[PDB]
Design a protein around this ligand. Structure first.
Ligand SMILES: O=C(NC[C@@]1(O)CCN(C(=O)c2cnc3[nH]ccc3c2)C1)c1cccc(C2CC2)n1
Length: 167
């Protein structure tokens, strides 16, 4: 039993809710919140910009030190950093950005990072400003993640479409 509330159950291990991931994280304080990161950990907009803003830019400060030490992530890769005031940990995961020409096949590799964590609060990878089809992202999620994932979808219209079209 966990503290996530109001989710629709899609499969044995995948759950979905129309919610602002920032507000959901502040309420649940999950062990792991997933950020829709880029390889530079520049949290400018989308989910990343919102999460970072909620940390009063502490996420960005920590991220800049991480990059200075380690260099950029790989597309499809991830790193674990602090969750600040939102979660114990933040798993920064880089899905391919279609608006940069990146291989959508890397979306499965990106979701594989979730399997290293027993329970996660997450957005749909590569959705939103990353330019991929969110219906496809949900499909890859369900077919790749085996751990317990609670998906927050900000847009109510998109949420209803994801549920109604789910196979
Ligand atoms: O946001 C979208 N896409 C990006 C993602 O892939 C990564 C973050 N995603 C979220 O839904 C999300 C969740 N909580 C959040 N709190 C603050 C921000 C924020 C975002 C999915 C999105 C929104 C509306 C329509 C479309 C359609 C055209 C493709 N996309």
């Amino acid at each position: 039993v966990n503290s996530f509330s109001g989710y629709l159950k899609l499969t044995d291990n995948v759950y979905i809710k129309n919610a602002d991931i920032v507000e959901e994280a502040k309420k649940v304080k999950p062990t792991v919140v997933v950020n829709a990161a880029n390889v530079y950990l520049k949290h400018g907009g989308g989910v990343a910009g919102a999460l970072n803003k909620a940390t009063n830019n502490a996420m960005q400060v920590e991220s800049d030190d991480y990059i200075a030490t380690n260099g950029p992530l790989k597309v499809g890769g991830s790193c674990v950093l602090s969750g600040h005031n939102l979660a114990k940990h933040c798993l920064h995961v880089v899905g391919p950005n279609v608006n940069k020409g990146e291989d959508i096949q890397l979306l499965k590799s990106a979701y594989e990072n979730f399997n290293q964590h027993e329970v996660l609060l997450a957005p749909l990878l590569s959705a939103g400003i990353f330019g991929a089809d969110p219906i496809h992202s949900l499909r890859v999620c369900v077919d790749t993640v085996r751990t317990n994932v609670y998906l927050a979808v900000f847009d109510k219209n998109l949420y209803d479409k994801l549920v109604s079209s789910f196979l």
